[PDB]
CSV table of C-alpha atoms in Angstrom, one decimal:
chain,number,residue,atom,x,y,z
A,1,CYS,CA,0.1,0.0,0.1
A,2,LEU,CA,2.8,2.4,1.0
A,3,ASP,CA,4.4,1.2,-2.2
A,4,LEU,CA,1.4,2.6,-4.1
A,5,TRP,CA,1.0,6.1,-2.3
A,6,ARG,CA,4.8,6.5,-2.4
A,7,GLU,CA,4.7,5.8,-6.4
A,8,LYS,CA,1.7,8.2,-6.6
A,9,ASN,CA,3.8,10.7,-4.8
A,10,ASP,CA,7.0,10.2,-7.1
A,11,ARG,CA,4.7,10.0,-10.5
A,12,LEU,CA,3.0,13.5,-9.3
A,13,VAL,CA,6.3,15.3,-8.4
A,14,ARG,CA,7.9,14.1,-11.8
A,15,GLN,CA,5.1,15.4,-13.5
A,16,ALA,CA,5.5,18.7,-11.8
A,17,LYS,CA,9.1,19.0,-12.7
A,18,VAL,CA,8.0,18.1,-16.4
A,19,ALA,CA,5.7,21.0,-16.4
A,20,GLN,CA,8.1,23.2,-14.8
A,21,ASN,CA,10.9,22.8,-17.4
A,22,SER,CA,8.6,22.1,-20.5
A,23,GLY,CA,5.2,23.5,-21.4
A,24,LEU,CA,3.1,26.6,-22.4
A,25,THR,CA,1.4,29.1,-20.2
A,26,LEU,CA,-1.9,27.1,-20.4
A,27,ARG,CA,-0.3,23.3,-20.4
A,28,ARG,CA,2.2,24.0,-17.3
A,29,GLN,CA,-0.8,25.3,-15.1
A,30,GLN,CA,-3.0,22.2,-16.3
A,31,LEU,CA,-0.3,19.5,-15.5
A,32,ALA,CA,0.4,21.5,-12.2
A,33,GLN,CA,-3.3,21.9,-11.2
A,34,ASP,CA,-3.7,18.0,-12.1
A,35,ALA,CA,-0.8,17.0,-9.9
A,36,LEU,CA,-1.9,19.3,-7.1
A,37,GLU,CA,-5.3,17.4,-6.6
A,38,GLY,CA,-3.5,14.2,-7.0
A,39,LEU,CA,-1.5,15.1,-4.0
A,40,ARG,CA,-4.8,16.2,-1.9
A,41,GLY,CA,-6.4,12.9,-2.7
A,42,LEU,CA,-3.4,11.1,-1.4
A,43,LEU,CA,-3.2,13.6,1.6
A,44,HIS,CA,-6.8,12.7,2.5
A,45,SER,CA,-6.2,8.8,2.1
A,46,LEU,CA,-3.2,9.1,4.4
A,47,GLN,CA,-5.3,11.4,6.7
A,48,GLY,CA,-7.9,8.5,6.6
A,49,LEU,CA,-5.7,6.0,9.0
A,50,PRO,CA,-4.7,6.5,12.4
A,51,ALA,CA,-1.2,7.5,13.1
A,52,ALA,CA,1.5,5.3,11.5
A,53,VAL,CA,5.1,5.8,12.3
A,54,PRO,CA,6.0,4.3,8.9
A,55,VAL,CA,3.5,6.7,6.8
A,56,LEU,CA,4.5,10.0,8.4
A,57,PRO,CA,7.7,10.1,6.4
A,58,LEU,CA,5.4,10.5,3.2
A,59,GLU,CA,2.5,12.5,5.1
A,60,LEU,CA,5.1,15.2,6.1
A,61,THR,CA,7.0,14.8,2.7
A,62,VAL,CA,3.7,15.0,0.7
A,63,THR,CA,1.9,18.0,2.6
A,64,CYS,CA,5.5,19.6,2.2
A,65,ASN,CA,4.9,19.2,-1.8
A,66,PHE,CA,1.2,20.3,-1.7
A,67,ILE,CA,2.1,23.4,0.5
A,68,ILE,CA,5.0,24.1,-1.8
A,69,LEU,CA,3.0,23.7,-5.2
A,70,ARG,CA,0.0,25.4,-3.7
A,71,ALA,CA,2.2,28.4,-2.6
A,72,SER,CA,4.0,28.4,-6.0
A,73,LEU,CA,0.8,28.4,-8.1
A,74,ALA,CA,-1.1,31.2,-6.1
A,75,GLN,CA,2.4,33.1,-5.9
A,76,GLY,CA,2.2,33.4,-2.4
A,77,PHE,CA,1.0,31.6,1.1
A,78,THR,CA,-2.4,31.5,3.1
A,79,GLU,CA,-3.7,30.2,6.6
A,80,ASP,CA,-5.1,27.2,4.8
A,81,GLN,CA,-1.4,26.2,4.7
A,82,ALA,CA,-0.9,27.0,8.5
A,83,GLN,CA,-3.8,24.8,9.2
A,84,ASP,CA,-2.3,22.0,7.1
A,85,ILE,CA,1.0,22.3,9.0
A,86,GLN,CA,-1.2,22.2,12.3
A,87,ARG,CA,-3.0,19.1,11.1
A,88,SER,CA,0.2,17.0,10.1
A,89,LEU,CA,1.7,18.2,13.6
A,90,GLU,CA,-1.3,17.0,15.2
A,91,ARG,CA,-0.9,13.7,13.7
A,92,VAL,CA,3.0,13.2,14.7
A,93,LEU,CA,1.7,14.2,18.2
A,94,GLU,CA,-1.3,11.7,18.1
A,95,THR,CA,1.4,8.9,17.5
A,96,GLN,CA,2.8,9.6,21.0
A,97,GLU,CA,-3.6,20.5,20.7
A,98,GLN,CA,-3.1,24.3,22.2
A,99,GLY,CA,-1.2,26.1,19.6
A,100,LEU,CA,1.7,26.2,17.0
A,101,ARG,CA,4.4,27.2,19.8
A,102,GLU,CA,3.5,24.3,22.3
A,103,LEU,CA,2.9,21.7,19.3
A,104,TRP,CA,6.3,22.8,17.8
A,105,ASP,CA,8.1,22.5,21.4
A,106,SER,CA,6.6,18.9,22.0
A,107,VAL,CA,7.2,17.9,18.5
A,108,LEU,CA,10.9,18.8,18.4
A,109,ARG,CA,11.5,16.8,21.9
A,110,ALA,CA,9.4,13.7,20.2
A,111,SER,CA,12.2,14.3,17.4
A,112,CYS,CA,14.9,14.2,20.0
A,113,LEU,CA,13.5,10.6,20.9
A,114,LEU,CA,14.8,9.9,17.1
A,115,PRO,CA,11.9,9.1,14.9
A,116,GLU,CA,13.8,9.2,11.7
A,117,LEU,CA,11.8,11.7,9.7
A,118,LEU,CA,14.1,14.7,10.6
A,119,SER,CA,14.7,15.5,7.1
A,120,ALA,CA,11.0,16.2,6.5
A,121,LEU,CA,10.5,17.9,9.9
A,122,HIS,CA,13.4,20.3,9.2
A,123,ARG,CA,11.8,20.9,5.8
A,124,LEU,CA,8.6,21.7,7.5
B,1,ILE,CA,-32.7,-19.1,11.6
B,2,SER,CA,-33.6,-20.0,7.8
B,3,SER,CA,-37.0,-21.1,6.4
B,4,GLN,CA,-35.9,-24.5,5.0
B,5,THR,CA,-34.6,-25.3,8.5
B,6,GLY,CA,-37.1,-23.7,11.1
B,7,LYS,CA,-34.5,-24.1,13.8
B,8,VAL,CA,-32.1,-21.7,16.0
B,9,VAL,CA,-28.6,-22.5,14.6
B,10,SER,CA,-25.6,-20.7,16.4
B,11,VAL,CA,-22.6,-19.4,14.3
B,12,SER,CA,-19.6,-21.8,15.3
B,13,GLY,CA,-17.0,-18.9,14.6
B,14,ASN,CA,-16.3,-16.1,17.4
B,15,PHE,CA,-16.9,-12.7,15.4
B,16,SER,CA,-17.1,-8.9,16.5
B,17,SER,CA,-18.9,-7.4,13.5
B,18,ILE,CA,-20.8,-8.7,10.3
B,19,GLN,CA,-19.8,-5.6,8.3
B,20,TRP,CA,-21.6,-7.5,5.1
B,21,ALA,CA,-23.5,-10.7,4.3
B,22,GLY,CA,-25.1,-12.5,1.5
B,23,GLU,CA,-24.9,-14.9,-1.3
B,24,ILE,CA,-21.9,-15.6,-3.8
B,25,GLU,CA,-21.5,-17.9,-6.8
B,26,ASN,CA,-20.6,-21.2,-5.8
B,27,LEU,CA,-20.8,-20.9,-1.9
B,28,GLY,CA,-24.7,-20.2,-1.3
B,29,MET,CA,-24.4,-18.1,1.7
B,30,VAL,CA,-21.5,-15.7,3.2
B,31,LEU,CA,-20.8,-13.5,6.1
B,32,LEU,CA,-17.8,-11.0,6.2
B,33,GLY,CA,-16.2,-9.9,9.8
B,34,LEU,CA,-13.3,-10.7,12.1
B,35,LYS,CA,-12.4,-12.9,14.7
B,36,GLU,CA,-10.4,-11.0,17.5
B,37,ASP,CA,1.1,-5.1,9.4
B,38,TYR,CA,0.8,-3.4,5.9
B,39,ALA,CA,0.7,-6.5,3.9
B,40,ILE,CA,-2.4,-6.7,1.5
B,41,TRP,CA,-2.4,-10.9,1.9
B,42,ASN,CA,-2.8,-10.4,6.0
B,43,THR,CA,-6.5,-8.7,5.9
B,44,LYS,CA,-7.3,-9.6,9.4
B,45,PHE,CA,-11.0,-10.0,7.9
B,46,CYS,CA,-12.4,-13.8,7.6
B,47,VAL,CA,-15.2,-14.5,5.0
B,48,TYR,CA,-17.3,-17.1,6.3
B,49,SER,CA,-19.6,-19.7,4.4
B,50,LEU,CA,-22.8,-19.8,6.4
B,51,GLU,CA,-24.0,-22.9,8.4
B,52,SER,CA,-20.7,-23.1,10.6
B,53,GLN,CA,-18.6,-24.2,7.4
B,54,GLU,CA,-15.1,-23.2,6.4
B,55,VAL,CA,-13.6,-19.6,6.9
B,56,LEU,CA,-13.2,-20.1,2.9
B,57,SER,CA,-10.8,-16.9,2.5
B,58,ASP,CA,-8.4,-15.1,4.6
B,59,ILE,CA,-6.3,-13.9,1.7
B,60,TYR,CA,-7.5,-10.6,-0.3
B,61,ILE,CA,-9.7,-8.5,1.8
B,62,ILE,CA,-9.1,-5.3,3.1
B,63,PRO,CA,-5.7,-4.4,5.1
B,64,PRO,CA,-5.6,-4.7,8.9
B,65,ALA,CA,-4.7,-0.8,8.8
B,66,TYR,CA,-8.3,0.1,7.7
B,67,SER,CA,-9.6,-2.8,9.8
B,68,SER,CA,-9.7,-0.2,13.0
B,69,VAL,CA,-11.6,2.6,11.1
B,70,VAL,CA,-14.4,0.6,8.7
B,71,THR,CA,-18.0,0.7,10.1
B,72,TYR,CA,-19.8,-0.5,6.9
B,73,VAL,CA,-19.1,-2.7,3.6
B,74,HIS,CA,-21.0,-2.9,0.5
C,1,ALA,CA,-48.1,6.5,-20.8
C,2,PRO,CA,-45.3,4.1,-18.7
C,3,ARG,CA,-43.2,3.0,-21.6
C,4,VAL,CA,-41.8,0.4,-19.1
C,5,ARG,CA,-43.6,-2.0,-16.5
C,6,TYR,CA,-42.0,-4.3,-14.2
C,7,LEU,CA,-44.0,-7.4,-13.7
C,8,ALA,CA,-41.7,-9.4,-11.4
C,9,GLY,CA,-38.2,-9.4,-9.9
C,10,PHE,CA,-35.9,-12.6,-9.5
C,11,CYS,CA,-33.1,-13.8,-7.3
C,12,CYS,CA,-29.5,-12.4,-8.7
C,13,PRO,CA,-26.1,-12.9,-7.6
C,14,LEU,CA,-23.8,-10.2,-7.0
C,15,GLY,CA,-23.1,-7.8,-10.0
C,16,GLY,CA,-26.0,-9.6,-12.0
C,17,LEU,CA,-26.7,-12.6,-14.4
C,18,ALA,CA,-24.3,-14.2,-16.7
C,19,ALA,CA,-25.0,-13.4,-20.4
C,20,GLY,CA,-26.0,-16.0,-22.9
C,21,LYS,CA,-27.5,-18.5,-20.7
C,22,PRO,CA,-31.0,-16.6,-19.8
C,23,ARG,CA,-33.8,-17.2,-22.1
C,24,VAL,CA,-37.2,-15.5,-22.8
C,25,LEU,CA,-39.9,-16.5,-25.4
C,26,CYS,CA,-43.4,-15.0,-26.0
C,27,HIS,CA,-45.9,-17.4,-27.4
C,28,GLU,CA,-49.2,-15.2,-27.8
């Protein structure tokens, strides 16, 4: 299953990069927004299971790609992406509430416990 | 209890939930459910050929991951 | 006025009926 999700992730990333390099004003945005909704759905599928230590490495990577691609296309951030980050962090905590500051403090203590997803956390 | 029987039969297998039930080709009558990690072939979900017969499949039902969250099957 | 009428319903397996084998004949 992780196989399929991971593959989907990879496929969509590569699609995005292809539109990045090649493409017209129209076709670029078409493939981008296509990959975007792929990633949404994948997020939602992964957000549909309880916690899963082995899934988080993707979840964090995917939400990263989602935020990046979202922000890039919009040519700016929003607060939706703040709440996306909030959701992913809530999830990290639920493995083992108040606000972003306490969340991050508890999360980075839970990272010094050495779950090997630091390369995603640091990205986050 | 069936018409054709007229008798109160007990289910031999000890299950929690019966998320789906019904007739399938070659088997006659069937229940989904369970008894009591990310491998598609593990499944944690026994089919049961009704009238206290063989489990009949434990091979390619839904993953055990999803086994905690699912409430209904169609 | 109803271009279709259902005058029976039958036991089917999952999906539905396997094609070729079922037969229908109208006498009068």
